[PDB]
From Swiss-Prot, chain B:
Glycosylation sites: 82, 204
Interval of the full protein contained in this chain: 788 to 1081 of 1474
Gene name of this polypeptide: A2M
Compartments, as annotated in UniProt: Secreted
Isoglutamyl cysteine thioester (Cys-Gln) crosslink site(s): 185-188
Record function comment: Is able to inhibit all four classes of proteinases by a unique 'trapping' mechanism. This protein has a peptide stretch, called the 'bait region' which contains specific cleavage sites for different proteinases. When a proteinase cleaves the bait region, a conformational change is induced in the protein which traps the proteinase. The entrapped enzyme remains active against low molecular weight substrates (activity against high molecular weight substrates is greatly reduced).
Subunit architecture: Homotetramer; disulfide-linked.
Cystine pairs: 34-62, 60-96
Organism: Homo sapiens
Protein name: Alpha-2-macroglobulin
Curated annotation (Swiss-Prot), chain C:
Organs and tissues of expression: Secreted in plasma.
Role: Is able to inhibit all four classes of proteinases by a unique 'trapping' mechanism. This protein has a peptide stretch, called the 'bait region' which contains specific cleavage sites for different proteinases. When a proteinase cleaves the bait region, a conformational change is induced in the protein which traps the proteinase. The entrapped enzyme remains active against low molecular weight substrates (activity against high molecular weight substrates is greatly reduced).
Top-level taxon in the UniProt lineage: Eukaryota
Assembly and oligomerization: Homotetramer; disulfide-linked.
Organism: Homo sapiens
Interval of the full protein contained in this chain: 1033 to 1081 of 1474
Gene: A2M
Family: Belongs to the protease inhibitor I39 (alpha-2-macroglobulin) family.
The protein, known as: Alpha-2-macroglobulin
Subcellular location: Secreted
Amino acid sequence: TIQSSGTFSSKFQVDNNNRLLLQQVSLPELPGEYSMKVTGEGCVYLQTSLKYNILPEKEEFPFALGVQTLPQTCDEPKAHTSFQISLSVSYTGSRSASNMAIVDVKMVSGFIPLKPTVKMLERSNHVSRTEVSSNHVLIYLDKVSNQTLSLFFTVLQDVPVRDLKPAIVKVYDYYETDEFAIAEYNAPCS
Amino acid sequence: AFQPFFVELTMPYSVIRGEAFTLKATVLNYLPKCIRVSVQLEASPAFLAVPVEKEQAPHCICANGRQTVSWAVTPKSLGNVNFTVSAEALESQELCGTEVPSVPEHGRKDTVIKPLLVEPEGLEKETTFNSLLCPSGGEVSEELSLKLPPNVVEESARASVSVLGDILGSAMQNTQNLLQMPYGCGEQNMVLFAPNIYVLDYLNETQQLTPEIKSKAIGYLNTGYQRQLNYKHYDGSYSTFGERYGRNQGNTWLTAFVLKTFAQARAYIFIDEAHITQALIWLSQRQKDNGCFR
Amino acid sequence: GRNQGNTWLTAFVLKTFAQARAYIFIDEAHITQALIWLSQRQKDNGCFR
Ligand SMILES: *[C@@H]1O[C@H](CO)[C@@H](O[C@@H]2O[C@H](CO)[C@@H](O)[C@H](O)[C@H]2NC(C)=O)[C@H](O)[C@H]1NC(C)=O
Ligand SMILES: *[C@@H]1O[C@H](CO)[C@@H](O)[C@H](O)[C@H]1NC(C)=O
């Protein structure tokens, strides 16, 4: 029994045949409250998940994703398409946890990379997996760094017409206690 | 095989909140005949379609006639959405050009139906919860409260539930892969042999998976252990390259992970019960009598 | 494989392998493996054949 605040109660049932049956049900309430009740013999476990978006406009935070997009503006008829975006990043909390794993680097709405493939192809800094996702970039496994490094890479304009809101590609995990340290900047050519 | 008409499009992408992208449509006549095609799109209140070519109809072209046909649209909903357009050729209008046959077969009107994704506003995540209930011929009930709305975005948040017991593993496409002797180093070799070992367990266990590549991975493992003969220590410990570091211990995940399977691997090629007791007896030594040894 | 061998020499030495375990290093693995090979040959009741 899946009962909610809004006078709502959906029932389900399970057996040897419903064993393998996924029973998906959602609700639209801003109230999130989930009373349940079952019966029978043995133990069994159900699970929940609550999807939602975040980061409308976060405020600044400890970590430094150093990204720079282009010469400060398109301001020319040829631009909005070819602009190499240079990204330059290292957090300091780097101690005795693991090898260098984390990154995320993706495209904005309507922008296709090529040479970005080839610049990642080049980079290798004393040790590297030459790892790649074909929408992202993975040259990270190495020893603890106080430095950063950087790179630069452009796109081609896949979208001629684009409503105003940016794309931002951030993942930021350094230490359990502190805030999780985001740093950001979008594309200005708009 | 042939069609004289085919539709190319603007694949939108998983796109931004503001949904006014650039949707176009283009059909091209590869038949030599100039034919009128009456066209429109099937829309809904699920989005805010906008007529770019409001007053005038994209009308008529000839063999390989290039025309770009687009509209503006700024949806309301989020998630994957299909877009249905239709393009039909009508008769009795020999006026767009000199003439218009417009007499196709059962593939009369060209219609295209396109699932495009819209990405919502903001960075995406979820929150879940985990609840069991185990009545033993009885009854148990639980309550779960589902709320963390700080710094919230418009109409963004939803949720669901399920439970499962699945049987019948279909398949194995998750299974296969391979790597080798690590060209860069003998350092990443620890992450080589470590999962390499329990591939023994899968050859036959799986009934979907590819045992042969795991029956190859033993072909490798018939060398894998030989490195561990080299990566061990004389006193008995193990390192990335082994001994020359005496009065110390080392990591034990890998030796603990393996030393069983060294004993499952002690069938095909022979490792002794000396290699396992020496591993062991090295362990017994590190134990203090009272303290959780430093 | 499934056999034993003479033991005068190994018994004669395995001590001095442990007196010789000062100058150049032989492990306490080399002596317990020698040993544990011996414990196996013992029956539970019979003076093993
Ligand atoms: C990054 O900073 C660390 C800080 O520990 C440097 O490591 C040592 O720094 C001390 C001074 O704090 C020096 O006396 C040592 O010679 C440094 N080396 C070591 C490993 O002890 C480190 O050199 C800096 N560079 C990187 C990339 O780690
Ligand atoms: C949209 O198209 C996809 C792929 O053809 C299909 O799986 C899905 O059911 C369609 N959704 C509809 C019919 O709205």
